[PDB]
Amino acid sequence: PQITLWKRPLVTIKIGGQLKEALLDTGADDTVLEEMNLPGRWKPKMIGGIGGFIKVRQYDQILIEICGHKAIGTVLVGPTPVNIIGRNLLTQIGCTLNF
Amino acid sequence: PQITLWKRPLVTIKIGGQLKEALLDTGADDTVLEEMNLPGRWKPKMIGGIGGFIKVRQYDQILIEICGHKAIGTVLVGPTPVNIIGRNLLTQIGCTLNF
Numbered sequence: 714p715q716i717t718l719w720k721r722p723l724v725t726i727k728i729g730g731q732l733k734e735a736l737l738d739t740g741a742d743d744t745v746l747e748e749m750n751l752p753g754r755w756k757p758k759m760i761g762g763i764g765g766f767i768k769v770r771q772y773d774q775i776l777i778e779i780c781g782h783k784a785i786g787t788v789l790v791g792p793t794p795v796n797i798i799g800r801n802l803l804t805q806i807g808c809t810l811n812f
Numbered sequence: 813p814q815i816t817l818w819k820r821p822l823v824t825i826k827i828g829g830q831l832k833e834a835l836l837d838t839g840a841d842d843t844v845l846e847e848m849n850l851p852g853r854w855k856p857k858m859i860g861g862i863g864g865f866i867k868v869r870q871y872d873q874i875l876i877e878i879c880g881h882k883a884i885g886t887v888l889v890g891p892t893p894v895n896i897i898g899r900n901l902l903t904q905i906g907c908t909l910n911f
């Protein structure tokens with residue numbers, strides 16, 4: 714599909730058995746999801762943007778389905794105000810910017 | 813052009829007659845640029861990111877050319893970690909997401 718940018722590019726994702734709304738974010742190197750209790754091992758990480766840094770938990774090789782497109786990669790979990798699909802997963806679903 | 817996302821979507825912009833590098837950021841509602849001198853009037857505003865809120869100077873109806881495409885709109889100037897081009901300008905140059 715083609716998504717215009719009049720409104721936030723929110724799409725439905727499936728992760729850890731749950732459906733959520735997430736932002737297709739070309740400005741995000743990594744995928745950052747709102748706080749959730751995923752199983753498995755993780756490593757602490759700090760990511761920074763406008764306003765400063767937040768502490769997140771890095772999970773690797775997590776399966777995510779984005780608009781019926783399957784993907785698997787690193788997912789960060791922490792106190793983000795929004796679910797953010799970053800470039801590490803956008804590349805896997807064949808997402809491009811066009812103008 | 814069609815821009816893949818295996819690298820940061822960085823492009824050259826022109827604003828106030830000066831060239832800069834900026835990030836095409838579909839996850840940003842607004843355009844926020846690093847500290848710079850801009851002619852014209854401005855008003856103080858606050859914007860929130862993943863790490864909290866920052867003070868910025870809002871410039872309205874500013875001419876800005878993005879990868880050869882012209883836009884005229886609001887530009888926020890403040891302590892952002894990166895020059896980001898947000899949806900308010902991405903729409904003006906006809907930018908869409910596609911997968």
Ligand SMILES: COc1ccc(S(=O)(=O)N(CC(C)C)C[C@@H](O)[C@H](Cc2ccccc2)NC(=O)O[C@H]2CO[C@H]3OCC[C@H]32)cc1
Binds near residue numbers: 761863
């Ligand atoms: C390492 O992996 C990372 C992944 C994501 C980020 S980030 O979130 O700080 N950022 C980065 C951008 C500011 C360069 C992505 C931007 O698209 C980021 C995503 C976001 C965070 C909080 C609330 C809404 C939207 N958007 C953002 O900061 O936009 C600003 C400017 O316009 C406003 O709309 C959204 C919030 C305001 C940082 C690191």
